[model samples]
Target: SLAPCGLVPSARQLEWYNREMIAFFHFGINTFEEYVNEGDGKASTAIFNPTALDCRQWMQTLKAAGIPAAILTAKHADGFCLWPSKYTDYSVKNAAWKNGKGDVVREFVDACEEYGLKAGIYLGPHDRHEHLSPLYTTERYKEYYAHQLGELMSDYGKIWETWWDGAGADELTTPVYRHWYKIVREKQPDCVIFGTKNSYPFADVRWMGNEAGEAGDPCWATTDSVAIRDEAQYYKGLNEGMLDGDAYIPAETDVSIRPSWFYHAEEDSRVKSVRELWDIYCTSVGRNSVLLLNFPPDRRGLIHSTDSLHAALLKQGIDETFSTNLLRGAKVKATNVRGAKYSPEKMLDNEKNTYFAGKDGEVKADIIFTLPKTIEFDCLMIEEVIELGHRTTKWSVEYTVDGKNWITIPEATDKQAIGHKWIVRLAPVKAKQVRLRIQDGKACPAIHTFGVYKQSPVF
Candidate 1:
C-alpha cells in the first residue's frame, strides 16, 4: 500500500499549475510617462491617456497565442488606479482618457470574459502617492488598501489570481498584510495569491528568485515558509523548494518580452524573438514552474504588433515541437512494476492520473521502450504523479541504435527529480529503443508521462 507525500497542492493550486503559462499586462501610468517616473508617484494624472486603448485587442492576441490567463496592473506603485476606485482620485477618473469616464480594469476584465481567459489583478502594496500625501497615516492607508481590495474582488466576475508586489513593503507592517489577506479571502475565497515575500501565509505561489524565466533543475513544490527572512537562503529556497517542507508554494517564473516591464518606444524592435521565447518556455513551464510572461502595452494601449507576432510564433513553435509523441504505440516494459494496475504502459496512456509505479521499497528500476522503427529525437519529456510527491532523485536515459548496444543520452544523464514535468533537450540521436533508468528515489517512483519528441526547426 502507498500514500501521498506530504504537502500536496490544494484544488486552487492544481488549477493554477495546469495553466502552464499566463500573461502579465504591465500597463499603468508608467506606460505613458518616463520609465524613471515609475514608483515615484510624481507623474500627473492628466498624463495618463491612451487615445486608442483597446483591451479587447489585447485579449484577442493572448487568446490567439494559446495563453489561458492574464493579470492586469490594476494599481501600480505610482498610485494610478486603472479602475475608477471610490477611494482614490489619482485614477482614471481624474485622467483625460475617455474624458475621465473610462475604466481600464473594467475593460480588461470584460475582454478576458469575451475571449475566455482567466483574469487576475496586480495591486502594488507600496503606494508612493499615499506615503507622500499630507493626510497619510499607516492606519488610514491600511483601511484604504482594504477598501481597494474589496472593490477588485467584489466587482470583478471571478479573479483566478491576485498578485501583491513586495517591492516597497518596508513602509508597511505585517498587520497590514494580515488585514489585506482577510479581505481577499472573504471576497474571493478560491482565488490564489502570489506574493514575493515568504511571510505572506496566504500566498499560493512563490517567485522563482530570478525574473529570467528559469527554474532550478530540481525545483520541488514544497517549502518551509513563504517569507524571506534570509536573502541567500530565501533565494535558494525560491529556486529550489525544500524536499520535505511543510508548505506547497510552487514557483512562478516571470519575465518581460521587452527589456522593461512597461512599454518603451525604443524597445519596439527589441521584442523577444520566437526562439528566445521558446527557450524561456522550455526552461520555465518545461521545468515544472508556471511562466508569467509580461506583455507591456504600447502608447496606443494595444499589444505591440511585434510582441503579438512573436508570442503567436512561440505558441506555434511549441505546438509543432510537441504535437506528436514519438513513443506512441511503442512497447513498454519495466524491471519492477508494483502491480497490473501500475503497469509501465500507463506512462504512455496520455492520462494525467494514471502512472507507472515501481514496486514498494524499490529504490532502483528501469523502464524500456521499443520503438516500431529506428527514429531520431532530441527531447525527453517526463512528468511524475506529483500527488504522490517527488520521489525519484536521480535518473538517466540510454538509447540503442541496434538491438545490442546502448549509449547514454548526454543531456539525460545525472538528471534531477521530475516533479510535475521535466523536459530534457539534447543533440538529436537515432534510436531503435530507449530506456529510462530510475537510479534512486525517496520512495517507489510514480511516473505519469515519459514522452519522446523531435523539436521542429527554429527557422
Candidate 2:
C-alpha cells in the first residue's frame, strides 16, 4: 500500500488551514519606542501612548483585505504588558495613557469580536523584567508565566490561538510547557498552541522554514519532524514546499508587511507594495500553507495609512483577477474514469466536497475542456480533493485555438508537487479549448477544482 498523502489534517487543524491568511500585530512597547531590543524592564510604560489608537481600523482594514484573524503580540520582550497584568507594574495600568486605566488587550479583543474576526495572542516566554529580578528563579518564573497565560486565556473571549516564542527559552528554565498549555485547554478548548518548535505531536502549526514569508512549492500539508534542514533552499530561491513527513502539521509562512516586525516612523518608506504582497501571497498560501503577514501598528496604535491602503488594494486586485472563472460551465471530457459515478464534470462544481476521480492504476489521465467561446486567460488554479490524498505528483496545461494542434503552455511546470492547490500565472493565451494532463500519480487522481481565470498584472 502506498503511504497516505501525509496524515490527514485534524478537524482543528483543518479549521486553521482554511483561514489561509492571518494578520500579526507586533504592537506594544516596541511600537512606541524608536530602536532597541531587550528593554529588560528598562522602558517606561509612560511613553507607551497611542495618540489615536484604533483597534477597529486594524481589524477592518485586514477584513476588507480578506484576512479572518489577528494575532497580537500583547506582551513583548520589553516586559511591558499591553493589558493591566497584576504580575507586573510595567503594564498599561501604570501608563499615563488613559490615565493608567485603558487596557490595550481588552480593546483589541473587543474590536475583534465586534468586527467578526478571531483573536490570537503571543506571550513571550523570556521576560526581560523578570530576568533582572534579584528573586528570579526558573521555578519562580514558571509561576509568573502561568499567571500571565491564565489572565489572557481566561479573559479573552474565544481565543483562536496562543503563540509562544522560544528564542530565549532554555530546557531547565522553562517548566513543562503543557502546564501553560493546559490553561488554554481549560479556558478555550478550541484554541491552538503554536510554540517555539514545529513537531506535529506538539504545535498545531510549524514555521515554514523561514521568517522571510516563503513556503515550499507543492508545499506538503504533511511532515514527519521534517523542519527545514537548512536555509539554503529558500535563500537561493529553489525549493518552495516541505519534504515528505508523517505528521499533518501544515506550515504557516510568517513575513512582515514592513521591513521590521515593530513599527517606526523612519520605516514608513518601507511598506510592502501591492505587487510584492501579491507575490508573497502566491508563494505562501498558494503553496498550500497559511500566511501570517505582520503589519505593525505605529505609535498612534493604528495600522499606517500606507499599510491599510495596500491591503485594501491587494484585495481589489485579487477580486478583479480571479473572481470570474473563465471555465465555469465548460463541457469537460476525461479520457479515463474509475466509473460512471465520479464524472470529470465534478471538477467544475466549485465544491471541495465533490471531486472527479479516475480508476485505480489510472495514474496517467487527461481532462479536456470545450469552452462555449474563445476565452483569454493568464492564470489557472487547481485544487486536489486532499481528503482522498495528494495523488497527482505531476500535471500540465495545454490550450488550442482551432482545436487541431494543442499547445502546451509553459507556466508553473517546474512545481511538480500538486497537493492541495497550485495557482499558476502565465502569459496571456486564447483558448476555445483547454486540456489538463495528469502525468504521474501514486494512484487515481482526485481533483476538487480546475479553475481558469484571466488576471492582469498589478501596476
Candidate 3:
C-alpha cells in the first residue's frame, strides 16, 4: 500500500490553490495622485473621488474572464480608508464622493457576492498618513490598527483572504501581527493571510520571491518554517520552498497588468498584451502557484477598457490552447504499479483525486503512452496529487515515432520536480508514443494527471 509522502495542504489552502488565478483591484487615493506612496499622509481626500465608481463592472470583467476571486485595497499606505471606519476621520465617509457616504468596500463585497466571486480585503500595515498624527505612539498606533482590522473583519460578510503588506513597515512597526491574527481567526476562521517578513508566521500564503509574476521552476508547497529569518534564505525559500519543510504554506504570484501597480494615465498605452499575459499564466499558474494579477482602476473608478479586453483575450487564448487532450484514449503502461488500485491508467482519467502510484520500493520508473496514430503536439501537462505530498524530485519526457527508437525532449529533461502542476512547451513533433521517465524521486511517485496537447499559437 502507498503512504502519504510529507506535508499536505489544509482544506482551505487546497481550495485556494484550486482557484489557480485571481484578480487584484489596486485602486485608491494613489489613482488620483501621481505617486506610489503618499508620504506623511498629506494627500487630499478631496481628489479621492471616482466619478463613475462601479464595482459590478469590475466583477463582470473578472467573471467573464474565468477568474474566481478578487482583492481590493481597502486601505493602502496613504492611510485613506475605502470603507467608512468609525475609528478615523480619514475615510471615504469624509470624502466628497457620494457626499461623504460612499463605501468602496461595501460595493466591492456586494458585487462579489452578486457575481459568485470570492472577496478579499487588503489592509496595508504602513500608514504614511497615520504616522504624522501628533497623537501617534506605538501603543496608540497598535490600537488604531487593531480597531480598523476589527471593523473590516466583523463588518464584512465573509472574507476569503486578508492581505497585510509588510513592505516599508517591517522595521518601522512593532510586532502586533499575533494580535491581528487573533482578531481575524475569531471573526473569519476560514480566511487566509498573505504577507512578507513578520506576518509570515501567521500567513497562509507567501510572496513568491519576486513581483515579476513567476514562481520558481520547482516550487514546492512545503517549507521548514513559515517565517525565515535570514534575508537571502527567506527570498530563496519564497522562490523554491523547502522539500522537507513541516509547514504547508504555498506561494502566491502577485503582479500588475500594467507597468505600475496604480493606474497612471501615461501607462494607458502600455498595458500588457494578450500574449504577455498568456506567458505569465504559464509561468505562474502553470508553475503550481496562484496568479494574483492586479488591475488598477483609473481615476474614473472603472477598470480600463484595454486592461479588461486583454484579460478576456488571455482567457480565450488559454481555453483554445488546451481545448483537447491528444492522449485521451491512448494506451498507457507503467514499469511498476503499487497495486491494482494504483494502475497507470488512473493518470489519464481526468480526475484530480485519482492517481497512479509506483510500487513502494521503486523510486524510479516509466509510464509509456502509445497513441493509435501518429500526431503532432507541442504542449505537455502533468500534475502531482499533492494531497499525498510532492515525491518526484526529477523527471524527463521522450517520444518515439517507431516502437524501438525514442528521442528525448531536451526542454523537459532538466525538470527538477512536479508539485501541483507543470506545463512544458516543446517543439512540435509527430509521434505515436511518449514516455514519462521518473528519473529520480524521494519516494515512490504518485502522478495524478498526464496530458498532451497542441497549443494554439498566441501570435
Candidate 4:
C-alpha cells in the first residue's frame, strides 16, 4: 500500500476505508461557480443555497447508508474556496451559493466533528485554467493558490485527506500546487492526505478518476474525483489499474446525484432518477468498489430540498429493509453464484472481505426484489432488531448457488441496531434470484417493512 508521508494512521482509517463506505461532494465552479468549462451548458449551484447545510445530516445519511466517511470537494479545478481564504477574489465571497456570505468548508468540518466523520478537502491548485493558463499565471496566481491551501490546511483543523484534480492541461496536477498544500507539515500534521501528489508515499491516500466506485485490480487509499461522460449522462466507471493493486490502497468513487457537478437553474428537472442512481450504485459500488456520491449545493449555497429528500429516502429505505421482518418465509436457491461478470476480477473478497456498495440514502421500500436480469443472489438480510450492544456487529452469511462450491457472504455479525447488514451477491446463477426458504429459519424477519429491491438496478 502507498503510505502517506511521516504520518502513521489509526486502525480506524484502515478498517473504515476497507469496509465502511464514503461519500464525496464535488462542488466548486463546476457546480456553483463555472459549469461551462466541463463541456456542459450548466449544472448550477445558484439554488444550491443550502440554508441548513447540515453536515451532520450529510454524515448521518452516509452512516445510515453504511458509509464510513464524508469528503467534500472543498475546491475544484475552478479553485473556489468554500471557506474564507486569503487567496483570490473568487470564492464564497464572490459566488452566489451563499448569497456571497457563507463558509461551507467550516460547516463541513464542524459537521464532521458532530458525526465523527473523517473530514477532508478536494481543493484545487488552479482557481481555474485562468489561474493556470498563460492568462493568469502571474505571481499573483501562485500566491492566491498557496494562500488558499495554507488557510484550508491550517484552519479547517484536522483533515483526513486533501484531494487535488489532475486537470492542469499542461501541468499533470491541478490549480492548487503541491508546494502550497505541503503546509500540512507545519499546519495540521495528524491528518491523512491524498491526491495526484503521491510524494509522501504513505503520507496520504491516492486518487485516480473524478467519479469512480472501486479502484480496479489494486485497492488502495485514493481519491476518485474525475468525471467521465463530460459531466452529463455519465455512468460511474473507473479505469483498471487505477489502484496499483497494493494493500492499503483505498480508493473513492465520486458521482453526483445530479447530471452536472454544480448547481444550475435549469437542472432542477434533471436530477438523477432513483432508478438511475440505483443502477449506478449497483454497477459502481456493487460491481466494483466504494463511492463518493456528490451532492453539491447550488446558488442558494445549500443542499436543495429535492436532493436532501432523496438522500433521506435512501437512508430510510436502507433502515427499513434491514429493519424488522425483512427476509422471512424466504429461502435462497442459486445457480452460478460465484461466477459473475466482475466477481473473478475482485482482489478484495468474501475471505479478505473488502468491498461494499451503498445507496445515496434517498429511497424507501415496501418489498424486496432482485437485481433485474441477474442470477445467483447472495443475501445476508436480517429482520429482527437485535439486542446486541454494539452500534453494529458482523455475522457470516454462508450460501451457495451451484451448490458445488459454497461461498459465504462476508458479514453475519449481530449488529442488532443495524438490524441486518447484508453483503451477498452471485455473479451468474442457475436461478435468477435465490429462493428464500422460511422453513428452518427462526421467528425472525417479522415486521412492517420489506426489501423493495436488491443493491442493484431493481431499486
Candidate 5:
C-alpha cells in the first residue's frame, strides 16, 4: 500500500500544508457517553461501531462552516480502531457496523474527496494499556498496525498530515511510534507529521476546552479546544485554562448540541441555547479561532439531530462573522500582519497589571474613530503587541472615545489579547477621536493583527 517511501516531496507537494483550520473527529467512548450530561466515562473500545455512518454530511458541514481540512481518530489511546485494519481483531471487522466489514477511514476520505476537503488521521501513541497489550505484544498487533497504516495511506489517496500522540514511554513504544510515522512518510510522502518533527510528535492542534473561543495570537505557547464538559453553566471570562501563551500552539474547542457524541434516546441536551451558541461565536470565532462542534454517528450510522445543530451554528456563526465583519469599514494594513515570527513579542492582560510593552518588533493598529450617523460607540478594545504571555492585563477597561478628554474606567487587561474589541458606554455628551490607549498590557503583543472593536446602541 505504500508508495516509494524514499520518494521525496516535490515543491508543489510541500505547498499543500496551507490548510490551517483542520476539524477533528473525536469519536470513541467519549462520543457515546453524554460528555454534556456528565455520563459515565468508560472504554468500550471493542464495542464501538457506527452502522449508518454518513461521512459526507460530516465533511460537508465542515466545508460549509469554512473548514478546509480534518483528521479522524482512526484509533485513540484507548486501542479502538475505527477502521478495519489487519493490526488487531478488535476492529470494525468484529463490530456490528457493515456486518463487520465496513472501513470508517476509507469512507471518511471518500467523504473528503467528494466535499473538496483534505483528510488526515491520528493513529495514537499506541494503546499499551493491558487489554490492548496482548493484542500488540505478539506479531499480530504490529502487523495489524502496519496493515491499517498501509491501507489508510494507499486507499485514502493523499494524506495531508498524519498525527502520532504519546511517545515518552519506553524503547518499544518509541520505535513503534517512529515506525508508524515512518510508514506514513513511506506511503504518503506529502504528509507532515502533525508536529514539526517525528521525534517530537505533537498533534497539529490541541483540544483545550469547549468554551467557544479561538487560539488568538502568540499561539507558539499553544491552544486547545475546550470539550463539552459537566452540566453546562453560564461560562465566565475568556476561561482561565482555555488560553495559554507559553506552551502555545493552535487551539480548538469541541462541544456537541446534545450530551452525546453519538446518537441515543436522550435528545434533550441536543440543542444548545441559541444565546449560548451566539456567546460561543463571540468567544471562538469572534476571538479569532475555529470551533469544531461534534456530530456523533449513532447506531444508524448517520448524523442525528444533534449534529445538525453544530452545522447550523457553525454556518450561521462563521458566515456572519467573516462576511460582514472584515473590519473593512475600519482599516487595513498594506500587507496582512498577525501575531507571529515576522512581527513582535508577548502581551499580558490581568486584573492586577494592565500596562503592556512592545516586543521583538510589535506595532499597533491605527484608526480614526468616526461614528455612523444612526449609531454611536463608547469604548474600543486593543490587540496584544508582544510575546510574553497568552493574556492581557486590563488597563482602563473603559476609556473615552477620543484620545482627548479622559475618563478612565479602571486598569484594563495587558500582556493578553482582547478578542480585538473594547467597548465604552456612550454618555450624554458625544466624544471623538477614539484611541485605544493601553493602560498596562503591551499593544499587540507578538505583533498580531492590531485593530479596535466598537459597539453601538442595539436599536
Candidate 6:
C-alpha cells in the first residue's frame, strides 16, 4: 500500500476539527469593563465579582445550540486571568468573588465535563496589564508567558485546543515562541495549538482572514500559504483552501454571536436572529471550515437570555431540516462505477464508512437518482470520503419535473469546494428526478453520501 498521506490532518487534529462547531467565551474582567477592548492593569480586581456567575448554564446553552466543544478566553487583551494563577497577582484570586479565591477556569472546565463537551483555552500573549508594568521587560514577560501556559496546560483536566495570536507582539523570533510550541506538544499531545503570527509551522489550525463568519468557497484543508500579518493579504486563502497546499492546516472562522465580543446592556436587543446565525453557519462551517462562535458572558456571568434564545432557535432549524434525508430511499444510477460494492447506491446507504467511486482514471462522471414521489427541498448535502483525502473538486446539481428535462439548479454562491461536508442551498424545488454531475475531480471522486433537506421556516 502507498504511504499514509502527508497533507491530511493528524489523528488528533482530525478529531478536533470534526467537532465542526465550537463556542468561544471571551469572559474575564472584560465582561464587567465599561469597554471590553479598553481593559488594562488600570482595572482592579475589586470590579470582578459576577453575582450570578454560572458556567454550567453557559455550557447547557451551547449544548442545545449543537456545539460539542468550547474555548474560554482565560485571559483576553486585558491581563486578568480567569484562573487564580499563582504566577500572577492580577487574577480571579485577587478578586472579591468567592472571598478572593474563585477559579473560573476550574468551574468552567468542570461544567463542560459534566455536560460532555470538550474544553479549550485562549491565553492572549500580549497582555494590556503586563504591557503597562513599569518593571516589565521582554525577557521577564517571556518567562511569565511560558509559566502561565504551563499552568493552563497542566492544570486543565484535558484541553482540546490552546488558541493564541500575536496581536501585541508581532516579533516571532523569540525563544519564548519556540518554547511555547515545545511545551504544548510535550504536555498536551492530544491538544491542537492555533498558530500565532509567523508560528504557522507549529500550528494545527489557521485563523480565517476575518472575524466575520465566512470561509472561501473553495476552502481546502491543504495549503502552502501561511497567515500573513499584512492587513490586506492576511485573508488571502481564508475562503478557499490552498489548491496546492504542502500542509493540511485548515481554516477556522471566528465571530461573535453578538455584534460585540463582550456583552453590553445597550446591545441587548442586537442578538443575532436564527436566520442570521444560520446564514453565518452556511458561510462558515458549511463552507468546510470550523465555526468558533463567541458568546460572551454578561455581568451576571451567564449567556444572555436573548443570545440563548436565538441559539436554541438556530438549533431547532438545523434539526428540523437535516434530521430526515429526502433522498434516503431513492433509486440511484451512476455513469461509471468501480464495482457493485463501490456503486452509486452506496452514497445513499447512510454510512460514512461505505462510499461510491468512479472507475480508475475516470475524470468526470454522473450520479442520477429518482424518488418515488416528487419532494421539495432547498438544500443538498454532499461529502467526500475524507479517509481517502478530499478528491471531489467541482460538481453541479440538477433536477427534473419529468425524467427527460433536467434543469441545473443554481447555488446560492457562484462556486464552492465540496469536501468533508458540503451543503448547497437553492430556491426550493420540487422534483422526482435529480442528478449530480462531477464537473471536475482531483482524482477518481469518491462520494460517501448524498443527502437533501428543506429548511424549516423561522418561527
> Backbone collision count in every prediction?
3, 8, 2, 93, 99, 6
**Candidate 6 wrong stretches, greater than 4 Å:** 1-6, 228-232, 412-416
Model 2 clashing residue pairs (backbone) = 215-240, 216-240, 216-241, 217-240, 217-241, 223-245, 224-245, 338-359
User: Cα deviation in Å at residue 231, candidate 3?
Assistant: 4.6
Where in model 5 is the C-alpha error above 4 Å? 1-22, 26-51, 126-147, 161-176, 185-248, 252-257, 260-262, 281-290, 325-368, 372-415, 418-432, 438-459
Which number leads on lDDT? 1
Residues 316-391, candidate 2, lDDT per residue (tens digit)? 8888887788987788888877665578888787665877778777777899999988999988888876666667
Between candidates 2 and 6, name the one with more favorable lDDT: 6
lDDT for 286 in candidate 6 is 83
Candidate 3 ranges with C-alpha deviation above 4 Å: 35-40, 172-175, 226-233
lDDT of 1 by residue, 1-459 (tens): 567756688888889988999999999889888764376788889888897899999988898789999999998888889999999899999888888999999999999999889999999888998888899998999899999999999998899999987776666666778898888778887788896553457778887788788888778887767434332447778788778766788888899999889999889999999988988888888888899999998778999999999998888778888878898888988898998889889989888688888877886889889998988998889998877777888999999977678798989998876888889889999989999999998888888888889887752
TM per prediction: 0.96, 0.91, 0.96, 0.57, 0.61, 0.95
lDDT of candidate 3? 0.84
lDDT of 6 by residue, 1-459 (tens): 112223566787678668988999988887777856547667889889999999999988988888999999998878999998879899998897888979999999999999999999999877879878789887788789889989999988889898986676565454667788888888988888777566667778777777889878778877664543332365666457576777777778889887788888778888877888898888877877788989988888988888888888888988888778898789988897888888889988887588888876675778888899999999888887665666666788889987778888878233446667777788899989888888766677788888888887852
RMSD of each: 1.6, 3.1, 1.8, 12.6, 10.2, 2.0
Q: Give a tens-digit lDDT track for model 3, residues 1-459.
A: 578777778777888888989899998887878755343467778778889989999998997789999999999888999999999888888787898989999999999999999999999888878888888876777788899999999987899999887666655332677788899989998898885676667878877778888888888887756443232457767787778777788888899999989988888899998888887888888888899999998888999989999998888778877778788788888897887788888888877588889888577879889999998989888898887778888999999997788898977896876887889888898889999999888889898888888887653
lDDT of 4 by residue, 247-320 (tens): 23334456777777767767778777665654455434432245567776664446666766665566555454
Off by over 4 Å in 1: 226-233
Stronger candidate by lDDT (1 vs 2): 1
TM-score of 4: 0.57
Q: Which 10 residues in a row give candidate 6 its minimum summed lDDT?
A: 1-10
lDDT of model 2 at residue 173?
29
lDDT of 3 at 13: 86
